[PDB]
């Protein structure tokens, strides 16, 4: 995450860190004790989910590690255009809830009134390095018209745009699949955006979570 700062230690109990091959791959959101939501482009072998983390460089008493037993990519995900960039991960071990491990409720209304938004993750910072401590930033939703102008013929109804006109606070590589939180609800998932990272004119593009209520519920309730 570029141009942000360290999160408050107790503000992100729903944040997951996804690992493969021993290093940080993506963010993710705990939405149910057995399920983490992330971006479909985070699908890699032997995913390891870490909950209750703040600093990746230290062993924390609140952390919980779980293997993934099932990875459910949206049937209409299109890697080329990033359309429908969403994936459900079923945990081997149900999350042992604590003050630092809690699910985040989903935004079910696509016409939700504007609320204060934020992003977070262990993605690349402004200096080009990967931080041990999770970064946070306030950002605002950008109108669909403004975003269509920023990325012509690239924005679908399955995408939301969000950014920061003042410093260009933005999500980046490694923040993928992390949450766009609006009014204490999951509004979006980190999907794609500008290269290099920065949202002054070309806002970050987020998977529009409100569009996936039925698919999420059907997947979680399946079998
Ligand atoms: N600026 C942003 N808001 C932003 C946030 C997250 C990401 N994640 C990387 C990422 N998204 C999708 C894929 C992907 C999908 C399919 C196939 C292979 C790759 N990879 C990228 C972002 O901006 C572009 C960007 C690209 C690379 C390095 N830095 C920034």
Is the distance from the beta carbon of residue 175 to the nearest atom of ligand 1 less than 6 Å?
A: yes
DSSP string, 73-108: E-TT-BTTTTBT--EEEEESS----BTTB----B--
The structure was resolved to a resolution in Å of 1.7
> Checking phi first, is residue 98 left (phi over 0); if not, alpha (psi -120 to 50) or beta?
beta
Cα 175 to ligand 1 centroid, rounded to whole Å: 9
Is the distance from the beta carbon of residue 79 to the nearest atom of ligand 1 less than 6 Å?
A: yes
Cα–Cα distance measured from residue 95 to residue 161, given in angstroms and rounded to the nearest whole number: 30
Q: Which residues constitute the domain of residue 26? A: 13-103+211-223
Element (H, E) at 148: helix 144-150
Domain identity same for 123 and 195:
yes
Domain identity same for 147 and 117:
yes
Q: Which two tokens stand for residue 110?
A: 């696509």
CATH assignment of the domain containing 30: 2.40.10.10
Beta bridge partners of residue 162, listed in sequence order: 141, 204
Cα–Cα distance measured from residue 21 to residue 13, given in angstroms and rounded to the nearest whole number: 25
Judging by beta carbons within 10 Å of its beta carbon (0-12, 13-18, 19+), is residue 202 exposed, middle or buried? buried
Cα 82 to ligand 1 centroid, rounded to whole Å: 9
Element (H, E) at 160: strand 159-163
Q: For 139, what's the count of Cα atoms within 13 Å in the CB-facing half-sphere? A: 37
| Nearest atom (ligand 1) to Cα of 172 | 5
Q: Which two tokens stand for residue 186?
A: 């999951």
Domain identity same for 190 and 218:
no
Cα–Cα distance measured from residue 119 to residue 135, given in angstroms and rounded to the nearest whole number: 8
Total domains in the fold of the chain: 2
Comparing CA positions, the residue from 186, 187, 194, 121 lying closest to residue 164 is 194
Comparing CA positions, the residue from 44, 67, 193, 52 lying closest to residue 123 is 193
Cα 192 to ligand 1 centroid, rounded to whole Å: 4
Cα–Cα distance measured from residue 87 to residue 197, given in angstroms and rounded to the nearest whole number: 23
Catalytic residue among 54, 66, 82, 85: 85
Catalytic residue among 66, 176, 191, 199: 176
Q: Which two tokens stand for residue 169?
A: 């606070």
Domain identity same for 54 and 87:
yes
């Amino acid at each position: 995450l570029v141009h942000g700062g360290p999160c408050d230690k107790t503000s992100h109990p729903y944040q997951a860190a996804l690992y493969t091959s021993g290093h940080l791959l993506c963010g993710g959101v705990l939405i149910h004790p057995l399920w983490v939501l992330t971006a479909a482009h985070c699908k890699k072998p032997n995913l390891q989910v870490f909950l209750g983390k703040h600093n990746l460089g230290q062993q924390e008493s609140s952390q919980e590690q779980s293997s993934v037993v099932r990875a459910v990519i949206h049937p209409d995900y299109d890697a080329a255009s990033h359309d429908q960039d969403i994936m459900l991960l079923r945990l081997a071990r149900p999350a042992k809830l604590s003050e630092l491990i809690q699910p985040l409720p989903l935004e079910r209304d696509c016409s939700a009134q504007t609320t204060s938004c934020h992003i977070l993750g262990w993605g690349k910072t402004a200096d080009g390095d990967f931080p041990d401590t999770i970064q946070c930033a306030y950002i605002h939703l950008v109108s669909r018209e403004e975003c269509e102008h920023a990325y012509p013929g690239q924005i679908t109804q399955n995408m939301l745009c969000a950014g920061d006109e003042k410093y260009g606070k933005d999500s980046c590589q490694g923040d993928s699949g992390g949450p766009l939180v609006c009014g204490d609800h999951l509004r979006g998932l980190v999907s794609w955006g500008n290269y290099p990272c920065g949202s002054k004119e070309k806002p970050g593009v987020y998977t529009n979570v409100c569009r996936y209520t039925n698919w999420i519920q059907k997947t979680i309730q399946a079998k």
